[PDB]
Amino acid sequence: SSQIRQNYSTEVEAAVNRLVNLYLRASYTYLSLGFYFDRDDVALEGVCHFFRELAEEKREGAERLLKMQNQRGGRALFQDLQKPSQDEWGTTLDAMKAAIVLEKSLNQALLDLHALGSAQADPHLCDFLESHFLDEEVKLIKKMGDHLTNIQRLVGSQAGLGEYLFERLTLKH
Amino acid sequence: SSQIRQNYSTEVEAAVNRLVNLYLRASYTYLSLGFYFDRDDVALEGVCHFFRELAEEKREGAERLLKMQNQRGGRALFQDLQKPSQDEWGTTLDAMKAAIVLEKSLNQALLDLHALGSAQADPHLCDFLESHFLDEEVKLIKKMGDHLTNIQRLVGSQAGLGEYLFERLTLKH
Amino acid sequence: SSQIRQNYSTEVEAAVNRLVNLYLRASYTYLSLGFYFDRDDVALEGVCHFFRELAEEKREGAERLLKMQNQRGGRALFQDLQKPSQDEWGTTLDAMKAAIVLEKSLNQALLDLHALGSAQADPHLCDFLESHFLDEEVKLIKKMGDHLTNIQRLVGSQAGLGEYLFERLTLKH
Amino acid sequence: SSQIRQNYSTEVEAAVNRLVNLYLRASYTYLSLGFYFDRDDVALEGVCHFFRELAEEKREGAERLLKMQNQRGGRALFQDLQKPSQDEWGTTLDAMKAAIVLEKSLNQALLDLHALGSAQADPHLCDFLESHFLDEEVKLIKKMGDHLTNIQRLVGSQAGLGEYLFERLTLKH
Numbered sequence: 001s002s003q004i005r006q007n008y009s010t011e012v013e014a015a016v017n018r019l020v021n022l023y024l025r026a027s028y029t030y031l032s033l034g035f036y037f038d039r040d041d042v043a044l045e046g047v048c049h050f051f052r053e054l055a056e057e058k059r060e061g062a063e064r065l066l067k068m069q070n071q072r073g074g075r076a077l078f079q080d081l082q083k084p085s086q087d088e089w090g091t092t093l094d095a096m097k098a099a100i101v102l103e104k105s106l107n108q109a110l111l112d113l114h115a116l117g118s119a120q121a122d123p124h125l126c127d128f129l130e131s132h133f134l135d136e137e138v139k140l141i142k143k144m145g146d147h148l149t150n151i152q153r154l155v156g157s158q159a160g161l162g163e164y165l166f167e168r169l170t171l172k173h
Numbered sequence: 174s175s176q177i178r179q180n181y182s183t184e185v186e187a188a189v190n191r192l193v194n195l196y197l198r199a200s201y202t203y204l205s206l207g208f209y210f211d212r213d214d215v216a217l218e219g220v221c222h223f224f225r226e227l228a229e230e231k232r233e234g235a236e237r238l239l240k241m242q243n244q245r246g247g248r249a250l251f252q253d254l255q256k257p258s259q260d261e262w263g264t265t266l267d268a269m270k271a272a273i274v275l276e277k278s279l280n281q282a283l284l285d286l287h288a289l290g291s292a293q294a295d296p297h298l299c300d301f302l303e304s305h306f307l308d309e310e311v312k313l314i315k316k317m318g319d320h321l322t323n324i325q326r327l328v329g330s331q332a333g334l335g336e337y338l339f340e341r342l343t344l345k346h
Numbered sequence: 347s348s349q350i351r352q353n354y355s356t357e358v359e360a361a362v363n364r365l366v367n368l369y370l371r372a373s374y375t376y377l378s379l380g381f382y383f384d385r386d387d388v389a390l391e392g393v394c395h396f397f398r399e400l401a402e403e404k405r406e407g408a409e410r411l412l413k414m415q416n417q418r419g420g421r422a423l424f425q426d427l428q429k430p431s432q433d434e435w436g437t438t439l440d441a442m443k444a445a446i447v448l449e450k451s452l453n454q455a456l457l458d459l460h461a462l463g464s465a466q467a468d469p470h471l472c473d474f475l476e477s478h479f480l481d482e483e484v485k486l487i488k489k490m491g492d493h494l495t496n497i498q499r500l501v502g503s504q505a506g507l508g509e510y511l512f513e514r515l516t517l518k519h
Numbered sequence: 520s521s522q523i524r525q526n527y528s529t530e531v532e533a534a535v536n537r538l539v540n541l542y543l544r545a546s547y548t549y550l551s552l553g554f555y556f557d558r559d560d561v562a563l564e565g566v567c568h569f570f571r572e573l574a575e576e577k578r579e580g581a582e583r584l585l586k587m588q589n590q591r592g593g594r595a596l597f598q599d600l601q602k603p604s605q606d607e608w609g610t611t612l613d614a615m616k617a618a619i620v621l622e623k624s625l626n627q628a629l630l631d632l633h634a635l636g637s638a639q640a641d642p643h644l645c646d647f648l649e650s651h652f653l654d655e656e657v658k659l660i661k662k663m664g665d666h667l668t669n670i671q672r673l674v675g676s677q678a679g680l681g682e683y684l685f686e687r688l689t690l691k692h
């Protein structure tokens with residue numbers, strides 16, 4: 001057991017394990033989003049790429065949390081990972097709305113863990129979240145919001161055409 | 174005071190100080206235009222970039238006037254800077270129309286100062302405006318006119334789509 | 347409006363807009379300080395350069411705040427910018443004392459916004475100030491203090507000579 | 520005679536010849552200033568260099584006027600060149616005051632020729648002065664004013680010491 005643990009509450013330890021589960025589930029959701037847009041009957045490569053990149057980012061977030069858990073002397077505990085909430089994700093607009101909802105949920109879990117850390121006077125935990133997660137999340141949510149607005153402007157006009165142009169001229173492919 | 178001042182009227186000195194104020198207010202207006210197009214619910218990066226670039230150009234114009242004021246032995250006097258005339262700037266078309274109006278106003282102030290300099294037989298002032306401002310202004314107004322025509326052609330067709338395409342295919346991003 | 351805003355109080359939003367105004371006014375003050383030292387009857391190039399550099403830094407601070415305001419889903423609102431408090435700034439010593447007073451005022455506004463953010467449990471805001479402003483401000487104020495001491499030591503001795511040597515041998519030109 | 524002359528008045532032709540004489544006399548004055556500061560009992564190398572550089576600049580100004588005279592089909596006419604007004608030039612401060620007076624005199628002759636050209640509707644002449652002389656003169660006079668202020672600040676304090684420091688730390692050597 002732990003010869004190193006210092007100022008690391010059982011409450012934070014458990015919440016970090018829950019947050020790892022939430023990041024891995026987000027990664028899984030993004031994997032499903034990504035492969036949906038690779039279907040021959042959907043075929044939006046840029047959209048596929050955008051969500052596959054987010055699957056990787058979320059998995060890396062989970063790995064960084066696990067590394068931190070060990071650095072503090074806590075013990076990683078893994079739970080089952082729930083499948084994503086949908087099997088088909090609709091249009092680019094539907095998908096980007098679902099992604100923003102998911103990110104807001106992750107952001108709220110980060111903020112809740114920051115508050116717990118503040119309450120338990122665990123500055124290392126607070127700084128770790130500040131330095132590696134909170135600003136990344138704000139930037140991502142802003143980028144998703146920007147995308148949502150641009151998609152909305154395009155598919156109001158003419159939906160098929162608008163969806164193609166967004167994929168071609170905004171997303172990387 | 175001034176050991177160097179020669180052939181530099183009090184009338185020109187004062188008008189140069191007023192023109193500095195007008196350039197700084199134009200810079201401020203462009204700062205507001207730029208950040209409006211960066212809002213998550215507007216999200217036209219190219220448009221944002223175009224106006225941020227103009228904010229910088231106008232500030233540089235003011236600095237060049239101040240440098241000249243000191244080179245001639247006049248004394249810079251700063252006044253309050255009025256906030257921009259709007260808090261929200263509408264569509265790309267609305268914004269480009271407002272920008273052309275602003276530029277025409279600055280161009281008229283340059284022409285009025287050139288006329289004062291001519292009347293006061295101040296060739297250094299006249300040449301300074303000719304060399305650093307009058308042609309820059311004509312070129313900018315032509316570019317804005319070109320943009321306005323292209324935006325008009327696009328948003329007559331289909332407004333959301335047209336605004337996106339102009340931002341993607343004309344403006345630098 | 348905002349699809350992205352999360353954990354961002356109206357109180358912080360307003361205070362960020364006020365802080366933008368304070369940074370822009372500081373930039374304006376530094377512009378005036380800089381051009382005063384470029385006058386032919388003052389003629390201290392290093393001093394001019396030092397304050398022009400600070401005008402740029404403060405403007406960049408304002409732009410970073412505006413970027414953050416949009417990233418969080420707040421709305422930039424601009425007010426009139428008050429002219430600087432003086433038209434002439436006296437000696438290098440007078441000017442450096444005025445600059446330290448101004449910086450302390452900006453530092454206090456940063457600390458007050460940090461306290462508001464702490465009270466509203468907005469860790470992103472707190473970290474943003476910590477990461478981009480609070481240490482920059484401490485370093486600048488230390489540098490100004492160092493300068494003030496050196497100027498004082500020089501102009502006690504022999505004021506004209508001392509002011510020239512400080513400009514030549516301390517400030518970059 | 521002239522197969523090329525067009526729109527070039529006899530009045531301008533004569534005034535250009537007088538201006539050549541004034542530039543050559545200024546060059547001669549600067550030659551004398553320069554060698555005075557090279558005397559073993561004056562020995563301010565930077566000051567010597569500053570005035571020798573101005574002797575060259577003024578000679579080049581005269582050559583450019585002569586080139587222009589031929590380009591327009593006028594005929595260069597040379598007169599005697601009056602010796603400089605002093606044989607010894609006093610201190611750096613005395614010398615810099617004499618130089619500013621001389622430059623103001625040259626600037627006034629340029630402005631008077633510009634006015635003649637304007638009155639005779641000779642835009643080539645007006646532009647030639649604007650492009651090659653008027654801004655050069657304003658910049659030089661500003662630089663001399665800056666120097667005068669710095670010398671004054673130094674030799675008020677302690678004259679010998681101040682004169683040495685200006686030569687060492689401001690002027691190029």
Ligand SMILES: [Cl-]
Pocket residue numbers: 082083
């Ligand atoms: Cl499930």
Ligand SMILES: [Cl-]
Pocket residue numbers: 255256426
């Ligand atoms: Cl107003």
Ligand SMILES: [Cl-]
Pocket residue numbers: 253428429
């Ligand atoms: Cl005020």
Ligand SMILES: [Cl-]
Pocket residue numbers: 601602
């Ligand atoms: Cl004589």
